[PDB]
Design an enzyme around this catalytic site. Structure first.
Site, PDB file in Angstrom:
ATOM      1  N   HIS A  62      22.497 -19.352  31.732  1.00 47.39           N
ATOM      2  CA  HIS A  62      21.114 -19.878  31.800  1.00 47.39           C
ATOM      3  C   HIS A  62      21.078 -21.118  32.700  1.00 47.39           C
ATOM      4  CE1 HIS A  62      21.728 -18.203  27.610  1.00 47.39           C
ATOM      5  NE2 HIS A  62      20.975 -17.307  28.223  1.00 47.39           N
ATOM      6  N   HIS A  92      22.620 -30.883  31.616  1.00 45.85           N
ATOM      7  CA  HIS A  92      22.403 -29.690  32.428  1.00 45.85           C
ATOM      8  C   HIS A  92      21.150 -29.911  33.272  1.00 45.85           C
ATOM      9  CE1 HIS A  92      19.897 -29.154  28.791  1.00 45.85           C
ATOM     10  NE2 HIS A  92      18.989 -28.749  29.656  1.00 45.85           N
ATOM     11  N   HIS A  94      17.676 -27.860  35.452  1.00 44.40           N
ATOM     12  CA  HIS A  94      16.730 -26.766  35.554  1.00 44.40           C
ATOM     13  C   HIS A  94      16.295 -26.951  37.007  1.00 44.40           C
ATOM     14  CE1 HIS A  94      16.414 -26.182  31.125  1.00 44.40           C
ATOM     15  NE2 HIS A  94      16.567 -27.491  31.012  1.00 44.40           N
ATOM     16  N   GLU A 104      10.809 -28.895  34.679  1.00 47.19           N
ATOM     17  CA  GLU A 104      10.137 -28.333  33.511  1.00 47.19           C
ATOM     18  C   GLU A 104       8.888 -29.161  33.230  1.00 47.19           C
ATOM     19  OE1 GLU A 104      13.474 -27.592  30.566  1.00 47.19           O
ATOM     20  OE2 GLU A 104      12.822 -25.596  31.218  1.00 47.19           O
ATOM     21  N   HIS A 117      18.680 -32.946  32.251  1.00 47.19           N
ATOM     22  CA  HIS A 117      18.499 -33.202  30.827  1.00 47.19           C
ATOM     23  C   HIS A 117      19.805 -33.691  30.233  1.00 47.19           C
ATOM     24  CE1 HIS A 117      15.072 -30.058  30.571  1.00 47.19           C
ATOM     25  NE2 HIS A 117      14.612 -31.244  30.986  1.00 47.19           N
ATOM     26  N   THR A 196      13.705 -26.574  25.380  1.00 49.81           N
ATOM     27  CA  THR A 196      12.886 -25.786  26.292  1.00 49.81           C
ATOM     28  C   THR A 196      13.419 -24.372  26.471  1.00 49.81           C
ATOM     29  OG1 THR A 196      14.042 -26.553  28.267  1.00 49.81           O
ATOM     30  CG2 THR A 196      12.153 -27.835  27.502  1.00 49.81           C
TER      31      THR A 196
HETATM   32  N1  LIG Z   1      16.631 -27.744  28.103  1.00 49.21           N
HETATM   33  S1  LIG Z   1      16.808 -28.676  26.744  1.00 49.21           S
HETATM   34  O1  LIG Z   1      15.647 -28.650  25.870  1.00 49.21           O
HETATM   35  O2  LIG Z   1      17.237 -30.054  26.918  1.00 49.21           O
HETATM   36  C1  LIG Z   1      18.125 -28.024  25.711  1.00 49.21           C
HETATM   37  C2  LIG Z   1      19.168 -28.815  25.211  1.00 49.21           C
HETATM   38  C3  LIG Z   1      20.172 -28.273  24.418  1.00 49.21           C
HETATM   39  C4  LIG Z   1      20.188 -26.935  24.100  1.00 49.21           C
HETATM   40  C5  LIG Z   1      21.323 -26.365  23.244  1.00 49.21           C
HETATM   41  O3  LIG Z   1      22.162 -27.184  22.892  1.00 49.21           O
HETATM   42  N2  LIG Z   1      21.512 -25.006  22.833  1.00 49.21           N
HETATM   43  C6  LIG Z   1      22.269 -24.850  21.601  1.00 49.21           C
HETATM   44  C7  LIG Z   1      21.720 -24.196  20.488  1.00 49.21           C
HETATM   45  C8  LIG Z   1      21.889 -22.781  20.366  1.00 49.21           C
HETATM   46  F1  LIG Z   1      22.557 -22.078  21.291  1.00 49.21           F
HETATM   47  C9  LIG Z   1      21.322 -22.128  19.217  1.00 49.21           C
HETATM   48  C10 LIG Z   1      20.605 -22.903  18.226  1.00 49.21           C
HETATM   49  C11 LIG Z   1      20.446 -24.326  18.370  1.00 49.21           C
HETATM   50  C12 LIG Z   1      20.998 -24.971  19.494  1.00 49.21           C
HETATM   51  F2  LIG Z   1      20.840 -26.297  19.612  1.00 49.21           F
HETATM   52  C13 LIG Z   1      19.154 -26.130  24.589  1.00 49.21           C
HETATM   53  C14 LIG Z   1      18.121 -26.642  25.380  1.00 49.21           C
HETATM   54 ZN   LIG Z   2      17.246 -28.432  29.541  1.00 46.70          ZN
END
Ligand SMILES: NS(=O)(=O)c1ccc(C(=O)NCc2c(F)cccc2F)cc1
Ligand SMILES: [Zn+2]
Ligand SMILES: [Hg+2]
EC number: 4.2.1.1
Length: 258
Positions: A62, A92, A94, A104, A117, A196
């Site tokens: 992703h 990471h 986007h 975003e 982010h 997100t």
């Molecule tokens: N783009 S963003 O909003 O900053 C963001 C930051 C972290 C994560 C993440 O840690 N995924 C883990 C995760 C899973 F894979 C499943 C459930 C909960 C989780 F935190 C996803 C999106």
């Molecule tokens: Zn992010």
């Protein structure tokens, strides 16, 4: 199948497997600068990244994350609208297929080329997994990237991308200093929101910096050469891995400046 950013599994389909997608505090959102409320009681942000220990960089299908050792208060975020200490776990980006899209969050409907982010979790919760079951479990520092001059501090990230071209690949990435990605000013907007990407949990205090950082055209070009697919599968370029802005609903975006 698994969620993605394509026509058949993109943002507009996420709601089917993650009903929270239509929730009350979803991110990202559009920051209407004239509507944000200057809140003089907002403290200055405190970013202590001097003891940061990066460990690995990985392509997860992703985006690519640079993971840090969060076993103790090495790199932390405090102050601002936050209560307590938040540990940096990963960062990471986007980005888009074109320079005019990729971020975003948007400012007055303006999209930037990419968005960084820096993900942190509230230490009060013991571990990241517990933190994501709480309305104030996470704090993500959002930074905008605009195309211009090269950002020296980003080059190390750019040089290792070849090693993690496809989903599942990772490379050891030690001694990287996240302080080289910060803009000069720490002025920001903040609002309660969510992850997100699925599962889109509403556990995030978003802190979006006003000042974007500049990266060269060649630097973002390298992000675009990454793949969504795993080794040996048909090539799908990793671009436009961003979710469109969501309804603000009953939320107020506060600004730490005027
Ligand atoms: N783009 S963003 O909003 O900053 C963001 C930051 C972290 C994560 C993440 O840690 N995924 C883990 C995760 C899973 F894979 C499943 C459930 C909960 C989780 F935190 C996803 C999106
Ligand atoms: Zn992010
Ligand atoms: Hg939560």
């Amino acid at each position: 199948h698994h969620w993605g950013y394509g026509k058949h599994n993109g943002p507009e389909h996420w709601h089917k497997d993650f009903p929270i997608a239509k929730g009350e505090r979803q991110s990202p959102v559009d920051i209407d600068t004239h509507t944000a409320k200057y809140d003089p009681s907002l403290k200055p942000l405190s970013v202590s990244y001097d003891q940061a220990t990066s460990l690995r960089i990985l392509n997860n299908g992703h985006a690519f994350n640079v993971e840090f050792d969060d076993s103790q208060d090495k790199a932390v975020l405090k102050g601002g609208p936050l209560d307590g200490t938040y540990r940096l776990i990963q960062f990471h980006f986007h980005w888009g297929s074109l320079d005019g899209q990729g971020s975003e969050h948007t400012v007055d409907k303006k999209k930037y080329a990419a968005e960084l982010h820096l993900v942190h979790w509230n230490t009060k919760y013991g571990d990241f997994g517990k933190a994501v079951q709480q309305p104030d479990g996470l704090a993500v520092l959002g930074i905008f990237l605009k195309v211009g001059s090269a950002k020296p501090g980003l080059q190390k990230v750019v040089d290792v991308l070849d090693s993690i071209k496809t989903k599942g690949k990772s490379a050891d990435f030690t001694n990287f200093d996240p302080r080289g990605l910060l803009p000069e000013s720490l002025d920001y907007w903040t609002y309660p929101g969510s992850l997100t990407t699925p599962p889109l949990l509403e556990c995030v205090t978003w802190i979006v910096l006003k000042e974007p950082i500049s990266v060269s055209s060649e630097q973002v070009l390298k992000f675009r050469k990454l793949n969504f697919n795993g080794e040996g599968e048909p090539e799908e370029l990793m671009v436009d891995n961003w979710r469109p802005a969501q309804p603000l609903k009953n939320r107020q975006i506060k600004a730490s400046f005027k």
